[PDB]
Short mmCIF file of C-alpha atoms and ligand atoms in Angstrom, two decimals:
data_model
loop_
_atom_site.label_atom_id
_atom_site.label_comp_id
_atom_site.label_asym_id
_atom_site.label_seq_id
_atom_site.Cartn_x
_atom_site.Cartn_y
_atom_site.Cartn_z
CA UNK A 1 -40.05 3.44 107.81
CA UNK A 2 -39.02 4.24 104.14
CA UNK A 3 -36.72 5.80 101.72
CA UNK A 4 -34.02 7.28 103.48
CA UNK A 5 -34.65 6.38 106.97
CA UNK A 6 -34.17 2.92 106.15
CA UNK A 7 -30.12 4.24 105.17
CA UNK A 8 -29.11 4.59 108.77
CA UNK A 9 -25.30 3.61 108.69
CA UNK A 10 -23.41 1.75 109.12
CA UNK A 11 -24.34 -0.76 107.31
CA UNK A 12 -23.14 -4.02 105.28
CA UNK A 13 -23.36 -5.75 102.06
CA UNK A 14 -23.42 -8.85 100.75
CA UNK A 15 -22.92 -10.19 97.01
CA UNK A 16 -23.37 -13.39 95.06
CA UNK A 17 -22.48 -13.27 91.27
CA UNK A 18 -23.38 -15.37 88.71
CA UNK A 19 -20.88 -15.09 85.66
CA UNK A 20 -20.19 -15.80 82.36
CA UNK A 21 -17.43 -14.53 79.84
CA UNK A 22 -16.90 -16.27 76.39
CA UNK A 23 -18.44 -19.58 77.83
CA UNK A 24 -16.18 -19.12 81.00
CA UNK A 25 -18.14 -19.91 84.02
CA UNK A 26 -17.43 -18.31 87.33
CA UNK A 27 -19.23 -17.17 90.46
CA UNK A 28 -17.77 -14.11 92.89
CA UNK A 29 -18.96 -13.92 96.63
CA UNK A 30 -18.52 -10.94 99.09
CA UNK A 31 -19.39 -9.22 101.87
CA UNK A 32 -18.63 -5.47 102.25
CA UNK A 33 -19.13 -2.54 104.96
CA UNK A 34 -20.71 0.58 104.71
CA UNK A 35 -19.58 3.14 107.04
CA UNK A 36 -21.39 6.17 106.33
CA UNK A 37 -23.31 7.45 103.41
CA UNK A 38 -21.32 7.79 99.57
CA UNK A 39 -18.58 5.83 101.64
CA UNK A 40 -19.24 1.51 101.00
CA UNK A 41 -16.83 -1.17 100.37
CA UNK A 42 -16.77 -4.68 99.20
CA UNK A 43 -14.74 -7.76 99.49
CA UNK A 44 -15.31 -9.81 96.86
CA UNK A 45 -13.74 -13.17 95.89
CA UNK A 46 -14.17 -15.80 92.98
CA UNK A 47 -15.57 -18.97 94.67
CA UNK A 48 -14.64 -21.30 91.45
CA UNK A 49 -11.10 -20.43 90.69
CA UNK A 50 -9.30 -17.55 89.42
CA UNK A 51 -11.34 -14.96 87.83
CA UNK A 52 -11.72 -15.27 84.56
CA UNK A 53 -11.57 -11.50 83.09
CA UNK A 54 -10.04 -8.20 84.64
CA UNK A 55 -10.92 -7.30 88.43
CA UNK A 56 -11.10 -3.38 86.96
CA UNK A 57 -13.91 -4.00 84.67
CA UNK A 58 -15.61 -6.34 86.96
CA UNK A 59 -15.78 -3.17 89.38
CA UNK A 60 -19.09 -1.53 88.65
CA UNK A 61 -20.96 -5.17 88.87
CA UNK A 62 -19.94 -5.20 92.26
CA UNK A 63 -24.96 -0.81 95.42
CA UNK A 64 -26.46 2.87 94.42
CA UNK A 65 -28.34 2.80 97.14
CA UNK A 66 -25.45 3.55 99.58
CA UNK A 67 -24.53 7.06 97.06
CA UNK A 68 -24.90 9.63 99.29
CA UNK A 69 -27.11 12.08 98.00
CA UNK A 70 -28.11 15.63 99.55
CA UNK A 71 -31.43 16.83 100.76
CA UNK A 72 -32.59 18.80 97.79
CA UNK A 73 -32.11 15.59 95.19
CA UNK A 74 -34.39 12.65 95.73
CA UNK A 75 -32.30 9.49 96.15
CA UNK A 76 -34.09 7.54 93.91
CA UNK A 77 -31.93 3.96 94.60
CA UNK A 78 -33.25 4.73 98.39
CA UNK A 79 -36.88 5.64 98.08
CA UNK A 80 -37.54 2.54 95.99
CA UNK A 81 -37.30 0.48 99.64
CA UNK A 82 -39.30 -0.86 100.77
CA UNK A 83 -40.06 -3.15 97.40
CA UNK A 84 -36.61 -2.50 96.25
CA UNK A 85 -35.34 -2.21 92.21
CA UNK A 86 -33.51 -3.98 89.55
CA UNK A 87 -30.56 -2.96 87.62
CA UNK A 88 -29.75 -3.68 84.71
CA UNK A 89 -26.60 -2.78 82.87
CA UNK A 90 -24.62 -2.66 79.38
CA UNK A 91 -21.02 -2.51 79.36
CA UNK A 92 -19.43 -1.86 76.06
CA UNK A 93 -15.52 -2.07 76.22
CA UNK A 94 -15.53 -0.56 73.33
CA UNK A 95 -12.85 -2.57 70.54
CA UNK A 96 -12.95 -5.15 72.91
CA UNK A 97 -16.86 -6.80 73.93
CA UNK A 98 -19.84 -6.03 75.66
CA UNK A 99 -21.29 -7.56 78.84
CA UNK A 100 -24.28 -7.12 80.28
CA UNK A 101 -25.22 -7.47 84.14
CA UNK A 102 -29.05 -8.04 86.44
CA UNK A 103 -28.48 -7.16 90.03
CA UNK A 104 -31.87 -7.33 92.66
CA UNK A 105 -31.66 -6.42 95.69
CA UNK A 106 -33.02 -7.06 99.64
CA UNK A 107 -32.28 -5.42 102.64
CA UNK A 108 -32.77 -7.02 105.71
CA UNK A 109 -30.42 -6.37 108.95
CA UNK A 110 -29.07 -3.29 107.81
CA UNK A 111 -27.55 -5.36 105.26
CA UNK A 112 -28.47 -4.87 101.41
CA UNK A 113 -28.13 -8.40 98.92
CA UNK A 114 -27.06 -8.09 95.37
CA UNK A 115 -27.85 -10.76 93.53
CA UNK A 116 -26.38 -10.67 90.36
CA UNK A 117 -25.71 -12.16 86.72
CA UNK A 118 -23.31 -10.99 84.03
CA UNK A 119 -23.07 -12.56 80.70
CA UNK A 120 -20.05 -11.41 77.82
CA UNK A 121 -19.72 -12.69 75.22
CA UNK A 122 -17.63 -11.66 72.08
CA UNK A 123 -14.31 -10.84 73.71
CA UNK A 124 -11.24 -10.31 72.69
CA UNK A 125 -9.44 -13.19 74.12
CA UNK A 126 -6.22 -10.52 73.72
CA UNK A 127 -8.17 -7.93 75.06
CA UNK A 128 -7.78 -6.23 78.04
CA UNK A 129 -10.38 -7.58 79.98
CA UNK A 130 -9.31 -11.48 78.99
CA UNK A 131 -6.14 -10.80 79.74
CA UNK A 132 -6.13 -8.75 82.82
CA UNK A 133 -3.86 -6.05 81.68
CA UNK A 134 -6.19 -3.35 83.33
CA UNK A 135 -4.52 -1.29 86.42
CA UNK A 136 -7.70 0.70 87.81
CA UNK A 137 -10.61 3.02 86.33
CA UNK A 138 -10.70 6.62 86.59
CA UNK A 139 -12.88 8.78 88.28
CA UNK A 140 -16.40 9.79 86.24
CA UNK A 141 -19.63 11.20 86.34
CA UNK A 142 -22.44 9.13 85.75
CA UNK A 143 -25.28 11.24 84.23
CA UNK A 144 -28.94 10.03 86.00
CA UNK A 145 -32.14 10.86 84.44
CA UNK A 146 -35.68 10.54 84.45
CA UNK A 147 -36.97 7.28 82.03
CA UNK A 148 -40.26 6.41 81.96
CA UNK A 149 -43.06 6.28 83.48
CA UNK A 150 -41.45 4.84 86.86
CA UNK A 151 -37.89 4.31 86.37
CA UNK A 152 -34.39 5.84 85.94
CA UNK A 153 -31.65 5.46 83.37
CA UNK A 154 -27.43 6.03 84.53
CA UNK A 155 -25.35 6.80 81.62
CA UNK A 156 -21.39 6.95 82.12
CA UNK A 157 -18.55 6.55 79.61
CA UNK A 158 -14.94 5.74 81.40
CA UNK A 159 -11.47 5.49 81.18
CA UNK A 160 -10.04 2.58 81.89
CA UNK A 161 -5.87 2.46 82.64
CA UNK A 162 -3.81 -0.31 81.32
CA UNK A 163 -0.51 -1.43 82.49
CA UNK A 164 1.22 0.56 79.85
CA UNK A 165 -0.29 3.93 80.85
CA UNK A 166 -3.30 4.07 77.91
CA UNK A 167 -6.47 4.14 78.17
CA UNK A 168 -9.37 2.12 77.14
CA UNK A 169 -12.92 3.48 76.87
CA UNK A 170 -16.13 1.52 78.20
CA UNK A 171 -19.52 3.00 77.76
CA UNK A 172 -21.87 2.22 80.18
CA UNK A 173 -25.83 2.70 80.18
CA UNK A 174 -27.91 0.91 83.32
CA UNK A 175 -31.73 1.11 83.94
CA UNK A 176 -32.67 0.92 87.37
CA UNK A 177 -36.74 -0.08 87.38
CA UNK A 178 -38.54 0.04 90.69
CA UNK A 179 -40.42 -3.62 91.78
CA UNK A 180 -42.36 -2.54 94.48
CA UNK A 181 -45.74 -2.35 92.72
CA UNK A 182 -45.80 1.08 93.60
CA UNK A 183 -44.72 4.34 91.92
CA UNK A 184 -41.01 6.31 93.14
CA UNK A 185 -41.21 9.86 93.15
CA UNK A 186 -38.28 10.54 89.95
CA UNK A 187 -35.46 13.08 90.73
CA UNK A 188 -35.08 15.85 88.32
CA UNK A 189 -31.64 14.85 86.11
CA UNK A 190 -28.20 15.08 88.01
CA UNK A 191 -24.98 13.28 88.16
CA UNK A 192 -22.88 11.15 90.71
CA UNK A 193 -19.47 11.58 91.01
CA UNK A 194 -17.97 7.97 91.52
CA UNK A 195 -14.66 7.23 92.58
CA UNK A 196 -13.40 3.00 92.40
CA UNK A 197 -10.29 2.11 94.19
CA UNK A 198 -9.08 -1.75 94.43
CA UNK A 199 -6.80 -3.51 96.57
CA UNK A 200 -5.13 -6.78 97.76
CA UNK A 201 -6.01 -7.74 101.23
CA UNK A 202 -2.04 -8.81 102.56
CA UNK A 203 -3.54 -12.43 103.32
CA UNK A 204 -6.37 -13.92 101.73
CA UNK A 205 -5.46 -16.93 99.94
CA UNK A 206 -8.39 -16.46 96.80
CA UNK A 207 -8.38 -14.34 94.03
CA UNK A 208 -9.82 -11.41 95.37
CA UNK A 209 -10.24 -7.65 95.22
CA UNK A 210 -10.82 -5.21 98.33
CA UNK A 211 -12.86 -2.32 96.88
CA UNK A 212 -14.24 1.06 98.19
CA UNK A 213 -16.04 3.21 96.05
CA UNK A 214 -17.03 7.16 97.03
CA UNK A 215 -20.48 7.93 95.07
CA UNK A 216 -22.01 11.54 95.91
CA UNK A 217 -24.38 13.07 93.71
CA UNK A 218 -25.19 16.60 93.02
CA UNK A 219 -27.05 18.77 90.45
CA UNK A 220 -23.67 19.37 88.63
CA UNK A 221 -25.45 21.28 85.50
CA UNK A 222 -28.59 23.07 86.54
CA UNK A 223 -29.91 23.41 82.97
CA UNK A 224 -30.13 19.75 82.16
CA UNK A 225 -33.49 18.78 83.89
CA UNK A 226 -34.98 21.08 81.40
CA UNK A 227 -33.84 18.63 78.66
CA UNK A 228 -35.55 15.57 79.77
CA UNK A 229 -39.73 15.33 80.42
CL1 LIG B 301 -7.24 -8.20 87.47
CL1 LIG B 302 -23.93 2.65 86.73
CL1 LIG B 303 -35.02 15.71 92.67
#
């Protein structure tokens, strides 16, 4: 049983986050459901306080493998199970600082793990992101290709809306390298269209976000695997 037979939903998620931003300390928890493929959401809450930085840029640390993907692209995120796959991540708010993030993975239960660490440092304690003035990011298309020998590299640049109704840009580049020992079949170069939305649950007494994201990919510009060998 591998690859995408091991995506039967629904499924769940957990998270534990190990943070850092401008010698801030914090840790987020969460545990999230998966209903049905490109369809997963995670509540998330900071388990030593109040955040310390903007819930909207914390949003892409908080699970590729759920994207839904059709038949004729190989879901990378997917076939690397079992053995599983690290992430790692930059995050340039660009004007404002750059963080970095390591997630790893394990699925057992039908539920996947993240473990993950994020370290910033260099922000602007004005900023945006220090001073939680963000209101949500907009939609994008993160640009996958081939890197490597084994691996994959996501590229995405995004808007993200402040309070005032302006936009900040963050550019994002994430290298997803299988751990399995063994080699994953790469898919030819594609996007996914990902979607982030963020709520309050009307109760819970932590800080907190509710979050859904929609991730589906498709072969959005057929000439592009041509570019990359
Ligand atoms: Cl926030
Ligand atoms: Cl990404
Ligand atoms: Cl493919």
């Amino acid at each position: 049983a591998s690859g995408r037979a091991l995506f039967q939903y629904p499924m769940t998620s957990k998270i534990e986050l190990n943070g850092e931003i401008n010698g801030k300390k914090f840790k987020v928890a969460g545990e999230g459901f998966t209903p049905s493929s490109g369809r997963f959401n995670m509540h998330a809450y900071c388990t030593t306080g109040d955040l310390p930085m903007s819930w909207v840029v914390i949003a892409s640390p908080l699970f590729h493998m759920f994207a839904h993907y059709p038949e004729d692209i190989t879901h990378f995120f997917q076939e690397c199970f079992p053995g599983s796959y690290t992430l790692d991540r930059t995050l340039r708010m660009e004007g404002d600082g750059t963080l970095t993030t390591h997630h790893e993975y394990s699925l057992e239960d039908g539920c996947v793990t993240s473990k993950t660490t994020l370290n910033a440092s260099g922000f602007d304690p004005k900023g945006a992101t220090m001073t939680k003035s963000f209101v949500k990011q907009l939609p994008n298309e993160v640009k996958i290709t081939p890197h490597g020998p084994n691996g994959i590299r996501l590229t995405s640049t995004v808007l993200y809306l402040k309070e005032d109704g302006t936009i900040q840009i963050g550019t994002q580049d994430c290298i997803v390298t299988p751990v399995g020992g063994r080699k994953v079949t790469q898919p030819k170069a594609h996007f996914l269209h990902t979607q982030i939305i963020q709520k309050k649950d009307p109760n819970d007494t932590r800080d907190h976000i509710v979050q859904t994201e929609l991730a589906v990919a498709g072969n959005l510009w057929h000439g592009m695997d041509e570019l990359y060998k």
